[PDB]
Design a protein around this ligand. Structure first.
Ligand SMILES: [K+]
Ligand SMILES: [K+]
Ligand SMILES: [K+]
Ligand SMILES: [K+]
Lengths: 146, 354, 354, 146, 354, 354, 146, 146
């Protein structure tokens, strides 16, 4: 999946929605302004955490090379596949790589940034559930890392 | 696809009992152990002249049974390893067989087979018998025993070095002093090397009895120096045992905390939300059908990627341990928030009434 | 009913000294121990030819005394067990005698009696003597010793396995290296099995002295390998001792907390209040005399049953241990309640003055 | 003590005082409303705990089968006899199955949901107190579990 | 009174170095130890025929020196004990000499003196020599060693009993199994008592070597059972050592807290204030000169007595240890006081503005 | 000055690997150890008559290599020590060579050199060989091993004294009781000194086997007393091992705290600010050019000196450990500040509205 | 020092100042009222502690037998002598039964219910101070227990 | 560097700016008044700590002998050289007596009473920095202790 030049131009056009002034950088102001226009309400500390994940210069900005790297990579990297698989394993006590559909539903809608019923319905539909009702989450992780 | 799915479940059960045992599955590996250890014993009993014949006849049958068992086990393991997505197809099987312990197992099996085939320089055929303890070595996954021992030894280096150093000095001094007293009367203490051998054998409390002091001055010196140095020669075992037990207690403590929780659950959610950006019915509407302003959806995806990366980090961090100073930190946060609340009351009273 | 009540108190005293001893009552069981152990010793001294006659004459009288004592004890225990409500009447006595240790006691008593009666194949009559240590086995209530040992061993499985594994490897290697050096010069090391016997006897520091290295190379190798492996052969005792002591300290700390308290006291109250719904003078009034609207009292009883069930649960829960994070939880509750109080002030100031 | 059909009908009539709408369920609203009409004042968390003790479906309700089971059983079960006896044993240091009348009086009126003087007077009258002043509480437990 | 006061200071120095030593004063008692222990050694060397003459001639002079030293010490101690108010005058001296260790010292001194005088049945005169270790027994003040050992042993009774019980069972079983295998081939194992002697000597790892298994079955059984039981025979030492060390650590932490403080200081103050009620210049005024209304001063004294008794109790309580739940208690007190303060604000705002 | 600076960096690297090793630098000193220890072994093997010739020829070459190595090392160390400001110039080199271990090294080197030169009373030339273990003694920096051992021994004095005292009493009693039973039958127990030798050798579990009880009464007594006293003879090792491990855990704990921090950073700042009072461009202005009112700048400097002295003290204090009662102290400070804030609100409401 | 009948009558007259109603008991009301009339200001919890030290009946009162016992005994008992001597020993690190005049002065005026300068001056005057400046506190304890 | 009499007179003239009344002592009032006139704002607890560092009499004052001792000594004493060198060693993990210019800059401007950029610029200029960018702080300590 070599990154092509047209794909780079489409990332550039998204990057320019944040950096409307043409300064080549995205600060918490530019990021948070676009987000709130869509009806999101991040906090300042959440905007700083987000920028810090890709800001190698440590000056509180995202530049286009950092933006392009994040967009090209998504979740395809091996670190993402391993950590997501480690998160499922927290809820796999048997150690057999399986989790119950009903147990997945409980964790997704009752912990963390809970999924809505419709979100979790789409998630269980997308996993090829076995007839017992058990989900092989390691093949679920490869579908999100492909 | 009910039969294929039942077959996959059977594959996963076999792979779990073979590679990641827990609970009852151990009753399998124990059996394998009792099959290997027994064999080893017989080979030792084959070194005795009076018991050689019987040991050989028993070992033949035992080793044939062992060959069959381990060949079947290798085949079943290589087949059942296909349940994981990493190893699938003949390429995946070859990738699974590339692990070092798997090729070691293949080597040991084929070597024993070819040895018994050539049996049909038998000294070398008997010397190849010691290769069987590798089937117990393979039970130690990535050398956890060596790593645990090395960690605990490195944590206590100063104490162990002190014990060994003081013990060595006491040994040298006691050997010299007993040698001076026993040289002319006792022929056991002919030289200083003899005295050093006596002293080490005495100070570890092995006490062979081949060398003993005969004079009363030597006996008084030996009693005093034994009282002094036997404690030094036994210190490392106590130090390491207490260290191991304290480590076990400190690990059992952290288990109760269950601090990591929430981060793992949120990571799966941020990953699903990011993934669903590109396939959800939420985006299969006339509104989203991309042609006029593609960047809007791209910007929405870029935000979900950033949140996914925040959740992955918070998830990885959970593994790291946390200090007991959190209570001070919550008081600092709680006090500061409340002190700021009284200020906001004070400013409003001063605004309205003045 | 003063005499019956004094008799019941005597029954309870006997049952308490016999089945649930505490404090001074132990001076009884100790005596029983000194009666059994002594007997055992004599039987061992009956295996020696030079001391057989005296041992037999002493054992006869000792065993007659023991028969009388234990028969009387069985009778007194079966009688005194009637104090509990569970065992009352001949049916209750039979139910008490159905416990496994009680029928074991009956078996041992009647077996020794019939053996001495048939004495009036004496080899079997002497071999039945070893059945007496069961009267010390019965002192271990439900096998608490085995359970404690198993718990502590299971908690430290990894360390023990590591110690035994490294020790076994060091033993094999040292035995081989000393065998290679001692084979031609010393006849003690005729085969490799001889070297393994020497190596194990040396490494546990038993040191019989039947096999010793005679050459100086063998002696240097033995000294080095002993220094290396004796610590490994002594590790399990230190590990288990430190584990036992840490467990004792951790159990002593829990007793000081006295957390369970209040729940046990409330359970008795909810049970009494429920019970008294059906017999209290509070319900023996013209008002409650049930004929026109029976459900009102039934509803009141249903509420007391629900509260009883809440109190029983809270009571069972108290047994479970509690974490040290309660202080954070009380600060969270305290801060939240206070922050809500400042809000209620703020809203009222904003309501009146605006 | 086989549960008879007339006993079932009397339980049903009590159950219907809570569930006046005929919905077949008792929530915190129905339970707490009947309780406060009698002058009791449970909290919401106390009403949830009470319902949770018999709500197997976990949906915050009591249905008639659960109500009937609780009413038929009362304290007669072996779990109740054992736990009540364990509660007395907390206050029996001797381990002889006895507790002093004066010690029972102190615990009943000074700990927990304290008994009034008249309540505790009836309780000590009902236990067949010995002449010393010591109470055999295990036969006291069987009278409440009979 | 400068000379009398200097003499009293010298008396107190002597009493402190003799009865309550600390720091450097130990260099005295150590000397006494080296004077007694040495003597004991010589008496042991007097039991050997070849070294009897020299031992006697040395012991005569050593014991004369010891007699003189200990007589002088007894006199100096009885004199210097007068510094305390309890022992003063000849009656106080007699009261000091009534302590059990003092009369034991007098007995030992006069007994050795009369023995040497009668020397001028010498077997009894030599057997009276063992009375000298009492001068080391007296160093243990009120038997602190026995009490410490008993406390730590009682705290760990269950573990020790478990270890001894399992070890005894393993010993019996291993002895029986080795006896069955060695009976006909080895004459060391003639009876079962012989096997039990071998088994105990092997399992404590003493290893005399007078009895060893000769067959290979017996050797394999012995190796396995030694691996199993040697850890059980070494458990009590590790348990008790870890218990002692944990007790020492738990004692060090209590010293750091320094909780008792304030109560001791306040007690002296309440005692002085009560005492001064009857002698202070504050009460030597025309106003207080008692003739018209004596009760007023008596009432003032009664109040000071009650406060003294409160201070004495609070002082005795400080010795008792305190829990780590005090932080929860201070938060409870702090929250309650603050919540009551916001209520007092709320009531005043509601009073003025309404 | 690039070459001089590179030379200084090389000097510092050599000084760091020689005097303050860390990480990989140890691979140097280990080598030195393997060079010294080996030599020592050879000298011991020179005491045996059968192996004297070979040992001498090997020792000659080994000692020549050792001479060259250690002379070169002394020269390189004395040269590289110049990197520090303290030792610079020939005076600084002489000051560096005045340390005791350096002059000990010089003494040992020149002594071995002159000995081998005189070799070209050889008994003294061979007896001077034992001076080589000082090159391992020098590895212990300021005797850290002795200080650690002494600290841990002093912290546990009471337990060790109790163990030794009870063990000594048990030894005396068991020796007497076994002597009484074995005197006439066994010639090993001729006197009481013989019994004491047997008893000590048995109770430390050395078990030479030269003296054993032959009668059955003696054997029963020995078994009982061994069971009783072997635990007492093994207690000090367990006590000291648990103490060492607890000390290691308690030191590893304090590392996580990292309390000292801020004070060291502030001290450098106060020192720089004081120093810069006399050289900063901030004071090189017409305004500061001192002629009319010199005291103003002196007063400013006096204030910086006082602040420097406050920072030095706070810095020295950080090294001292801190208690876990700080949380109570922060609550006390936080509550007091907040309670004072509600008072300031209350006073202002009462001022305006009244 | 046999307690005489005239001494008993003088204690009775003091006791009657507290118990002015003739009820034969002293509660916190009677005790605290007399104390505040003299210008003292005990708290309620301090009045309860004081009464509790001599109230064997545990009903919150002092009767005349308890009052007489306290007044006859003062500090003369052996428990008082031992505890006071133990309090001095807290500040005797040498263990020689001595304390410095200056150290006594620091503890008396800086800890606890601090003595005034004049109080502590009278206390140091009353101890027969040695020429060095060291106080033998065990003979100081016997003067307060005589 | 023998302390001369003219140097003593210049210290006396500075001392008299604090002690303007001629009482021979400097309290927190005199010290803090001169400091605030120059625009400094110490707290009362900071003024007490400063005086306590040189107040041997413990009465809360500085007299001229104490003032002269502090002024004559500055940082030249061996205690100052050792403690300053120990402070640098906190930040020398290698143990080689070196610290990076950039690491010194971070510690000086981010911890404690942070140096301004210009202060820290002068400090790094004054240390003879090596070409790598590493500072030998032990010769830096001798320049401040000379
Ligand atoms: K041994
Ligand atoms: K041994
Ligand atoms: K031995
Ligand atoms: K031996």
């Amino acid at each position: 999946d070599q990154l092509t030049e047209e794909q780079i131009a489409e990332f550039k056009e998204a990057f320019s929605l944040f950096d409307k002034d043409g300064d080549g950088t995205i600060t918490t102001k530019e990021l948070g302004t676009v987000m709130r226009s869509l009806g999101q309400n991040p906090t300042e500390a959440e905007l700083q955490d987000m920028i810090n994940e890709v800001d190698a210069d440590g000056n509180g900005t995202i530049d286009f090379p950092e933006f392009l790297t994040m967009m090209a990579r998504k979740m395809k990297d091996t670190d993402s596949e391993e950590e997501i698989r480690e998160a499922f394993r927290v809820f796999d006590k048997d150690g057999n790589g399986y989790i119950s559909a009903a147990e997945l539903r409980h964790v997704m809608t009752n912990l963390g940034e809970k999924l809505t019923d419709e979100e979790v319905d789409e998630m269980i539909r997308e996993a090829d559930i076995d007839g017992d009702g058990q989900v092989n989450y390691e093949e679920f992780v490869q579908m999100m890392t492909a | 696809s009910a039969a294929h799915k039942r077959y996959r479940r059977l594959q996963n059960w076999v792979y779990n009992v073979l590679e990641r045992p827990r609970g009852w599955a151990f009753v399998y590996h124990v059996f394998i152990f009792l099959l290997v250890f027994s064999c080893l014993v017989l080979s030792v009993l084959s070194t005795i002249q009076e018991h050689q014949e019987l040991a050989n006849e028993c070992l033949l049958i035992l080793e044939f049974v062992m060959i069959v068992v381990f060949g079947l086990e290798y085949i079943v393991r290589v087949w059942s390893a296909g349940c994981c997505c990493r190893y699938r197809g003949w390429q995946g099987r070859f990738r699974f067989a590339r692990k070092p312990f798997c090729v070691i197992d293949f080597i040991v099996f084929v070597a024993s087979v070819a040895v018994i085939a050539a049996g049909t320089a038998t000294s070398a055929l008997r010397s190849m018998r010691f290769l069987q303890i590798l089937r117990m070595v393979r039970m130690d996954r990535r050398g956890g025993t060596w790593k645990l021992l090395g960690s605990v030894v490195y944590a206590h280096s100063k104490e162990l070095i002190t014990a060994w150093y003081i013990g060595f000095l006491v040994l040298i001094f006691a050997s010299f002093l007993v040698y001076l007293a026993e040289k002319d009367a006792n022929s056991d203490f002919s030289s200083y090397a003899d005295s050093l051998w006596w002293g080490t054998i005495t100070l570890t409390t092995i006490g062979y009895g081949d060398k003993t002091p005969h004079t009363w001055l030597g006996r008084v010196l030996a009693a005093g120096f034994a009282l002094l140095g036997i404690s030094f020669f036994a210190l490392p075992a106590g130090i390491l045992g207490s260290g191991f037990a304290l480590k076990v207690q400190e690990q059992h403590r952290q288990k109760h905390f269950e601090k990591r929780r929430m981060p793992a659950a949120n990571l799966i959610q941020a990953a699903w939300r990011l993934y669903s950006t590109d396939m959800s019915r939420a985006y299969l509407t006339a509104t989203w059908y991309d042609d006029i302003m593609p960047a809007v959806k791209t910007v929405i995806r870029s935000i979900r990627i950033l949140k996914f990366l925040v959740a992955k980090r918070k998830f990885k961090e959970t593994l790291r341990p946390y200090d007991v100073k959190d209570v001070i930190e919550q008081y600092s946060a709680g006090h500061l928030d409340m002190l700021g609340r009284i200020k906001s009351l004070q400013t409003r009273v001063d605004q309205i009434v003045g």
